[PDB]
Amino acid sequence: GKTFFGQPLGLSTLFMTEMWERFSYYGMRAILLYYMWFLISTGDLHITRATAASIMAIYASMVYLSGTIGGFVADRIIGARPAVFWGGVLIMLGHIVLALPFGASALFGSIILIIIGTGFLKPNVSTLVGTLYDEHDRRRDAGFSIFVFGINLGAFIAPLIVGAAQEAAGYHVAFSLAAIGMFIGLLVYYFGGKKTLDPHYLRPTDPLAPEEVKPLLVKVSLAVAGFIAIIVVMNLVGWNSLPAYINLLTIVAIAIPVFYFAWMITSTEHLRVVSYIPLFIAAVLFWAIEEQGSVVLATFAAERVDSSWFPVSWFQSLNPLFIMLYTPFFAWLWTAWKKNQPSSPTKFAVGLMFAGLSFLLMAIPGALYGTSGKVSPLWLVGSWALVILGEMLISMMSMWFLSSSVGSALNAQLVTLYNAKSEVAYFSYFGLGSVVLGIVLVFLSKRI
Numbered sequence: 101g102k103t104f105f106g107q108p109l110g111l112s113t114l115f116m117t118e119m120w121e122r123f124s125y126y127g128m129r130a131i132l133l134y135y136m137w138f139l140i141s142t143g144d145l146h147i148t149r150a151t152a153a154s155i156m157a158i159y160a161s162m163v164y165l166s167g168t169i170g171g172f173v174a175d176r177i178i179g180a181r182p183a184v185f186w187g188g189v190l191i192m193l194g195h196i197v198l199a200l201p202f203g204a205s206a207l208f209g210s211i212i213l214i215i216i217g218t219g220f221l222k223p224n225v226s227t228l229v230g231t232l233y234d235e236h237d238r239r240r241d242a243g244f245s246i247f248v249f250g251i252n253l254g255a256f257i258a259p260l261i262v263g264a265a266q267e268a269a270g271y272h273v274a275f276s277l278a279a280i281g282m283f284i285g286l287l288v289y290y291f292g293g294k295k296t297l298d299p300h301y302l303r304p305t306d307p308l309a310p311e312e313v314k315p316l317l318v319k320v321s322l323a324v325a326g327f328i329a330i331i332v333v334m335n336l337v338g339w340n341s342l343p344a345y346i347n348l349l350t351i352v353a354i355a356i357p358v359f360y361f362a363w364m365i366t367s368t369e370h371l372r373v374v375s376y377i378p379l380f381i382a383a384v385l386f387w388a389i390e391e392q393g394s395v396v397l398a399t400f401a402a403e404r405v406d407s408s409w410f411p412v413s414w415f416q417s418l419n420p421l422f423i424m425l426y427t428p429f430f431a432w433l434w435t436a437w438k439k440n441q442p443s444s445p446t447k448f449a450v451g452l453m454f455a456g457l458s459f460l461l462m463a464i465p466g467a468l469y470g471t472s473g474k475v476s477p478l479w480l481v482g483s484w485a486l487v488i489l490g491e492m493l494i495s496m497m498s499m500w501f502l503s504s505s506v507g508s509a510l511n512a513q514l515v516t517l518y519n520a521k522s523e524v525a526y527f528s529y530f531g532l533g534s535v536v537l538g539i540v541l542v543f544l545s546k547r548i
């Protein structure tokens with residue numbers, strides 16, 4: 101009987117749905133930094149390029165922090181399938197905002213819409229993939245691997261299409277393509293879902309009991325009130341610049357796992373929770389480096405590379421391209437390698453060392469040739485080749501979204517240090533540091 105690569109046919113609907121959402125997200129991000137550079141260049145947007153880079157990082161951080169509660173809201177309040185649909189709608193609207201004939205004034209509205217939308221859609225589209233399978237089913241992990249391939253499929257073709265469109269017909273048109281991408285995702289999702297998805301997930305699977313409603317409301321109200329109080333105080337004391345607000349979001353993002361871990365810490369349980377701290381840190385630092393590809397490596401692509409024969413935003417395709425290219429091998433690897441299939445911590449250790457190697461490699465062209473000229477595109481190609489080796493090793497949903505969010509929050513401060521005069525030191529020191537405490541994670545690995 102017909103399947104989608106051996107899997108239930110529903111996977112095809114969810115495959116394409118996420119491929120097109122990821123298309124809209126990554127197509128937009130492959131030109132967003134350049135768009136801000138452009139807005140700065142015309143005097144419309146009053147920030148430094150450093151701050152612009154910082155915005156890209158905290159933006160990514162908020163997008164995944166939002167997903168850490170998206171699952172809850174679907175499971176307990178609105179249902180997984182409506183979460184994805186209305187999430188998709190909010191994302192489309194976010195891209196439409198940028199297609200409108202506005203400038204810097206439209207940036208915030210776009211960002212908020214996409215942050216909220218992605219929080220609803222991403223964890224729940226992934227959750228729905230699981231719903232295709234009985235828990236007894238063995239295909240389940242193959243199904244997600246296919247799903248992830250779809251994620252990177254969209255991530256791969258989006259910069260090629262949106263970037264080319266930007267150079268040809270301008271930014272607004274290019275952003276409109278992203279919106280259209282999400283629109284296409286919603287169409288397939290809506291009509292394909294009705295044919296192939298369980299109507300069980302039109303509603304929340306664990307709806308709030310009567311006595312649970314008021315305490316939840318109290319809880320979120322106190323969080324919103326406290327957050328609002330801090331912003332009030334910040335303006336009183338004069339800490340009300342954009343970087344001040346970015347610093348606030350950074351702190352909140354990092355305070356969450358810290359606050360979390362610190363007071364969940366019988367004696368044995370205590371330690372095994374403490375056992376996952378270094379692995380959480382490993383994921384955070386790895387995703388820090390991985391997410392810098394769209395910021396620092398994007399900057400390097402635009403400023404330090406001779407690629408005058410194609411849109412520089414196309415370098416953003418190398419990351420998911422390598423994912424797709426590496427997948428057949430690692431499929432072969434994990435089967436064929438049966439004994440000594442290594443510690444989940446070790447996969448984290450090595451994965452971080454590779455990330456560290458990817459940056460160390462980028463320290464070389466400036467050390468050898470200087471930083472005022474331009475170097476071969478192959479440095480970036482080699483750099484992404486290394487960091488994606490790590491990502492192959494690295495692959496609750498919330499925690500996963502959380503490690504990423506903290507990584508990008510860290511980036512929001514780090515990437516402000518990058519410039520052509522810091523380049524070599526920047527790459528070398530953050531590169532070495534990552535290798536070193538990926539090695540430190542080897543000393544500790546089995547001590548765990």
Ligand SMILES: CCCCCCC/C=C\CCCCCC(=O)OC[C@@H](O)CO
Binds near residue numbers: 162169215356
């Ligand atoms: C106009 C404002 C738009 C609001 C959209 C921005 C939302 C960004 C982040 C959502 C904050 C939720 C806090 C996350 C949280 O509670 O912790 C995650 C939970 O998994 C703890 O492990």
Ligand SMILES: CCCCCCC/C=C\CCCCCC(=O)OC[C@@H](O)CO
Binds near residue numbers: 168172173498
């Ligand atoms: C229609 C309103 C859209 C803007 C807000 C979207 C709703 C976002 C958050 C609602 C708060 C729900 C509480 C989140 C929460 O407590 O998460 C608990 C955490 O354990 C998640 O696993």
Ligand SMILES: CCCCCCC/C=C\CCCCCC(=O)OC[C@@H](O)CO
Binds near residue numbers: 186
């Ligand atoms: C300026 C804001 C524009 C917003 C316009 C968006 C209107 C979109 C759809 C109109 C109603 C269709 C309802 C479809 C729906 O509820 O989907 C439910 C979802 O669970 C599908 O699986």
Ligand SMILES: CCCCCCC/C=C\CCCCCC(=O)OC[C@@H](O)CO
Binds near residue numbers: 155158323
């Ligand atoms: C407890 C609630 C957490 C709130 C999370 C914060 C979500 C709100 C905004 C996030 C936007 C990130 C920064 C976007 C930005 O600075 O762009 C605006 C600027 O370009 C306009 O001049």
Ligand SMILES: CCCCCCC/C=C\CCCCCC(=O)OC[C@@H](O)CO
Binds near residue numbers: 242249256428
């Ligand atoms: C990069 C140019 C586009 C060509 C991509 C190949 C055809 C595109 C989509 C159909 C294949 C999607 C399923 C991918 C797949 O079979 O997964 C392989 C491996 O991860 C096992 O799950």
Ligand SMILES: CCCCCCC/C=C\CCCCCC(=O)OC[C@@H](O)CO
Binds near residue numbers: 196276
């Ligand atoms: C169905 C809703 C999602 C699809 C969005 C539909 C977008 C369709 C057309 C958007 C046109 C955007 C380009 C308009 C524009 O400002 O171009 C700038 C031009 O004047 C300079 O080259």
Ligand SMILES: CCCCCCC/C=C\CCCCCC(=O)OC[C@@H](O)CO
Binds near residue numbers: 189196290
């Ligand atoms: C400049 C563009 C116009 C701005 C508003 C565009 C609104 C476009 C689309 C609204 C949501 C489309 C959702 C697609 C879908 O499958 O919905 C089906 C549902 O309505 C059937 O009841």
Ligand SMILES: CCCCCCC/C=C\CCCCCC(=O)OC[C@@H](O)CO
Binds near residue numbers: 316
């Ligand atoms: C799109 C909806 C997101 C809701 C944002 C969260 C609002 C803040 C606190 C939760 C208040 C309870 C709202 C959920 C609710 O109405 O529960 C009713 C139902 O689950 C049981 O009666």
Ligand SMILES: CCCCCCC/C=C\CCCCCC(=O)OC[C@@H](O)CO
Binds near residue numbers: 331
């Ligand atoms: C729903 C959660 C609380 C949001 C209600 C109060 C909203 C006020 C501020 C939201 C914090 C976002 C920080 C980004 C921001 O405000 O941009 C800074 C801009 O004014 C630069 O001057």
Ligand SMILES: CCCCCCC/C=C\CCCCCC(=O)OC[C@@H](O)CO
Binds near residue numbers: 333339344348351
């Ligand atoms: C008021 C104390 C409540 C608990 C602490 C919560 C976080 C406290 C301060 C965070 C404010 C944002 C980061 C600090 C800040 O604004 O930097 C100032 C500087 O950027 C202005 O140029």
Ligand SMILES: CCCCCCC/C=C\CCCCCC(=O)OC[C@@H](O)CO
Binds near residue numbers: 348351355359513
């Ligand atoms: C008693 C609580 C456990 C021990 C306290 C741990 C501290 C808790 C939260 C601190 C947030 C991390 C600091 C955020 C950060 O590194 O950003 C620095 C920068 O944004 C400040 O301008």
Ligand SMILES: CCCCCCC/C=C\CCCCCC(=O)OC[C@@H](O)CO
Binds near residue numbers: 457463467525528
């Ligand atoms: C997997 C193999 C790829 C290895 C690539 C990384 C190679 C190892 C170290 C490269 C470090 C280059 C440091 C050059 C340097 O920092 O000196 C430059 C300085 O003197 C001028 O600013």
Ligand SMILES: CCCCCCC/C=C\CCCCCC(=O)OC[C@@H](O)CO
Binds near residue numbers: 464
């Ligand atoms: C799986 C481990 C990855 C193995 C990677 C091995 C790569 C070995 C060395 C890479 C260092 C960069 C070489 C420096 C270089 O070629 O510069 C010379 C070049 O500019 C041509 O004149």
Ligand SMILES: CCCCCCC/C=C\CCCCCC(=O)OC[C@@H](O)CO
Binds near residue numbers: 464467468
């Ligand atoms: C696994 C082998 C990969 C080779 C990595 C070795 C690369 C080490 C350093 C980068 C090449 C030297 C760059 C030129 C250099 O640093 O000379 C010092 C110069 O900057 C002082 O003016």
Ligand SMILES: CCCCCCC/C=C\CCCCCC(=O)OC[C@@H](O)CO
Binds near residue numbers: 406409414415476478
């Ligand atoms: C996105 C992948 C990057 C493609 C890797 C290609 C790297 C190899 C060579 C790049 C530059 C040399 C070939 C292009 C070139 O400069 O030809 C000369 C031309 O610019 C004269 O106008």
Ligand SMILES: CCCCCCC/C=C\CCCCCC(=O)OC[C@@H](O)CO
Binds near residue numbers: 461479481
């Ligand atoms: C499966 C392979 C993954 C690991 C590969 C590591 C790649 C290491 C280095 C690649 C880039 C360094 C070589 C750059 C290069 O070709 O020199 C530039 C030369 O064209 C002068 O313009």
